[PDB]
Amino acid sequence: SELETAMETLINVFHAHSGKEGDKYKLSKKELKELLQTELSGFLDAVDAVDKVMKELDENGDGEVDFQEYVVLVAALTVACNNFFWENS
Amino acid sequence: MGSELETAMETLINVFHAHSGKEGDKYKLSKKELKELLQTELSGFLDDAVDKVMKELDENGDGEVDFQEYVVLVAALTVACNNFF
Ligand SMILES: [Ca+2]
Ligand SMILES: [Ca+2]
Ligand SMILES: [Ca+2]
Ligand SMILES: [Ca+2]
């Protein structure tokens, strides 16, 4: 089903950039940045914003973003994108 | 032209709107609409389990699931899908 394919895409995208350096299930900054710039063009602004973004997602604090912390991100970006396209104008 | 990640996110939002706009508030899932979503979008869903899924997701207690509460479901399911692999 469409929903199931979508969650499959979220998993596959994560590992497509998570499996490039070191632990193939955790995103280091080079992999997080790679995911952000390639999958979310324009999400970064403002002096290095990439540091801020792992600082917020790295919940346990090991310097890498795993799947659950990455899902915390996808969720917030999904709800904001929804409010932007689905308002009782 | 969105990215693969972006396309997938759109699908989630679209799926929710696909069942949310059937009756009542076009931006909230009623009990009947929630049943419809589970049965069509989750190939494994067995079944009153919908009541459980309602009381579990209805954080604010209005009797309907809005988007912010439906993402709680999608997120929990996504990590659960990832565990299964
Ligand atoms: Ca890695
Ligand atoms: Ca972490
Ligand atoms: Ca509705
Ligand atoms: Ca609610």
Side-chain angles (χ1 to χ4, degrees):
Chain A
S1 89
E2 272 156 352
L3 177 53
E4 293 169 320
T5 309
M7 298 177 285
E8 191 180 48
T9 292
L10 309 181
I11 300 160
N12 287 127
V13 172
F14 175 85
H15 294 100
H17 308 282
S18 178
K20 278 181 178 176
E21 293 169 334
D23 190 314
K24 80 167 238 174
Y25 306 100
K26 293 160 112 78
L27 288 166
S28 76
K29 278 189 173 180
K30 188 158 158 188
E31 296 175 322
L32 168 69
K33 207 196 138 221
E34 166 173 280
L35 193 149
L36 297 177
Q37 284 178 317
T38 60
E39 299 294 330
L40 300 169
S41 186
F43 177 58
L44 285 163
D45 47 77
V47 184
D48 274 298
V50 55
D51 309 83
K52 179 59 163 60
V53 175
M54 177 163 294
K55 180 60 181 308
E56 199 174 321
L57 289 171
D58 191 8
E59 198 152 0
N60 52 17
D62 51 5
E64 290 196 274
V65 174
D66 55 50
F67 191 71
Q68 293 92 54
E69 292 162 342
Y70 150 85
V71 164
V72 178
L73 176 68
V74 169
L77 292 182
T78 302
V79 310
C81 189
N82 180 75
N83 292 325
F84 193 73
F85 279 96
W86 288 93
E87 63 185 342
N88 250 345
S89 293
Chain B
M1 282 182 330
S3 82
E4 234 175 328
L5 175 50
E6 298 172 315
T7 319
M9 306 184 52
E10 286 160 26
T11 299
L12 312 181
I13 312 159
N14 282 342
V15 152
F16 170 101
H17 286 106
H19 309 284
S20 178
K22 300 297 187 58
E23 265 296 290
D25 194 315
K26 279 214 139 220
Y27 302 98
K28 293 160 112 174
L29 287 165
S30 78
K31 174 171 197 185
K32 177 62 221 69
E33 297 180 325
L34 177 72
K35 183 173 171 187
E36 188 186 57
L37 190 149
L38 299 175
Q39 282 292 329
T40 61
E41 300 296 328
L42 299 173
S43 318
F45 182 87
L46 318 170
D47 178 10
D48 270 298
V50 62
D51 301 27
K52 155 185 91 78
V53 158
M54 173 62 66
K55 300 187 187 62
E56 199 173 320
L57 288 172
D58 193 9
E59 199 215 344
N60 53 18
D62 52 8
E64 290 193 70
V65 175
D66 51 53
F67 195 74
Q68 64 180 20
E69 293 169 347
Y70 151 89
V71 308
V72 180
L73 171 67
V74 168
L77 290 180
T78 299
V79 310
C81 186
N82 184 68
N83 291 324
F84 186 50
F85 180 65

Tab-separated table of all heavy atoms in Angstrom, chain A residues 26 57-66 69, ligand 2:
chain	number	residue	atom	x	y	z
A	26	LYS	N	24.216	4.423	11.586
A	26	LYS	CA	24.240	5.728	12.230
A	26	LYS	C	24.776	6.766	11.247
A	26	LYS	O	25.743	6.509	10.520
A	26	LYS	CB	25.108	5.688	13.511
A	26	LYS	CG	24.530	4.828	14.627
A	26	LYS	CD	25.611	4.434	15.626
A	26	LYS	CE	25.414	5.087	16.978
A	26	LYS	NZ	24.359	4.391	17.760
A	57	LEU	N	19.119	16.690	17.375
A	57	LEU	CA	18.602	15.346	17.141
A	57	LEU	C	19.319	14.261	17.931
A	57	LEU	O	18.708	13.232	18.230
A	57	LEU	CB	18.691	15.012	15.659
A	57	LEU	CG	17.687	15.787	14.823
A	57	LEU	CD1	17.991	15.557	13.365
A	57	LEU	CD2	16.271	15.340	15.178
A	58	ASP	N	20.606	14.446	18.234
A	58	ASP	CA	21.415	13.454	18.944
A	58	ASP	C	20.952	13.347	20.396
A	58	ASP	O	21.541	13.907	21.322
A	58	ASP	CB	22.888	13.820	18.863
A	58	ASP	CG	23.782	12.710	19.347
A	58	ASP	OD1	23.269	11.607	19.608
A	58	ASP	OD2	24.992	12.950	19.497
A	59	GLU	N	19.888	12.569	20.590
A	59	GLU	CA	19.209	12.530	21.879
A	59	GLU	C	20.088	11.903	22.958
A	59	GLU	O	20.309	12.505	24.015
A	59	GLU	CB	17.895	11.770	21.733
A	59	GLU	CG	16.904	12.008	22.841
A	59	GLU	CD	15.481	11.826	22.360
A	59	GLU	OE1	15.293	11.507	21.161
A	59	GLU	OE2	14.554	12.006	23.180
A	60	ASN	N	20.596	10.690	22.715
A	60	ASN	CA	21.500	10.059	23.677
A	60	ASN	C	22.852	10.761	23.745
A	60	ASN	O	23.535	10.686	24.776
A	60	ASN	CB	21.698	8.586	23.328
A	60	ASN	CG	22.109	8.380	21.884
A	60	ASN	OD1	22.547	9.311	21.209
A	60	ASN	ND2	21.989	7.150	21.406
A	61	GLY	N	23.249	11.447	22.669
A	61	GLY	CA	24.446	12.265	22.668
A	61	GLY	C	25.744	11.578	22.282
A	61	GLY	O	26.784	11.853	22.884
A	62	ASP	N	25.722	10.704	21.276
A	62	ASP	CA	26.937	10.025	20.840
A	62	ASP	C	27.575	10.645	19.604
A	62	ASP	O	28.592	10.131	19.124
A	62	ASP	CB	26.661	8.546	20.569
A	62	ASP	CG	25.478	8.334	19.663
A	62	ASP	OD1	24.928	9.338	19.163
A	62	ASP	OD2	25.113	7.161	19.432
A	63	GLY	N	27.016	11.728	19.078
A	63	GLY	CA	27.604	12.374	17.926
A	63	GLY	C	27.163	11.816	16.599
A	63	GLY	O	27.748	12.171	15.567
A	64	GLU	N	26.166	10.940	16.594
A	64	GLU	CA	25.630	10.384	15.367
A	64	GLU	C	24.115	10.306	15.503
A	64	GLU	O	23.589	10.140	16.608
A	64	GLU	CB	26.230	8.992	15.063
A	64	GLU	CG	27.703	9.028	14.652
A	64	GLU	CD	28.175	7.740	13.997
A	64	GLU	OE1	28.577	6.802	14.723
A	64	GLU	OE2	28.142	7.672	12.746
A	65	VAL	N	23.423	10.416	14.369
A	65	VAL	CA	21.966	10.349	14.311
A	65	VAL	C	21.561	8.952	13.850
A	65	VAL	O	21.900	8.544	12.730
A	65	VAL	CB	21.401	11.416	13.360
A	65	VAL	CG1	19.891	11.256	13.194
A	65	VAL	CG2	21.752	12.805	13.855
A	66	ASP	N	20.833	8.218	14.702
A	66	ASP	CA	20.325	6.904	14.326
A	66	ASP	C	18.921	7.053	13.751
A	66	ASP	O	18.415	8.165	13.579
A	66	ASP	CB	20.340	5.917	15.496
A	66	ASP	CG	19.593	6.435	16.719
A	66	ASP	OD1	18.427	6.892	16.561
A	66	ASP	OD2	20.145	6.316	17.844
A	69	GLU	N	16.039	8.933	15.996
A	69	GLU	CA	16.233	10.377	16.020
A	69	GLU	C	15.961	10.998	14.651
A	69	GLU	O	15.441	12.112	14.568
A	69	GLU	CB	17.651	10.646	16.505
A	69	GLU	CG	17.838	10.252	17.968
A	69	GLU	CD	19.293	10.100	18.357
A	69	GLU	OE1	20.134	9.952	17.450
A	69	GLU	OE2	19.604	10.164	19.561
C	2	CA	CA	22.333	9.737	18.579
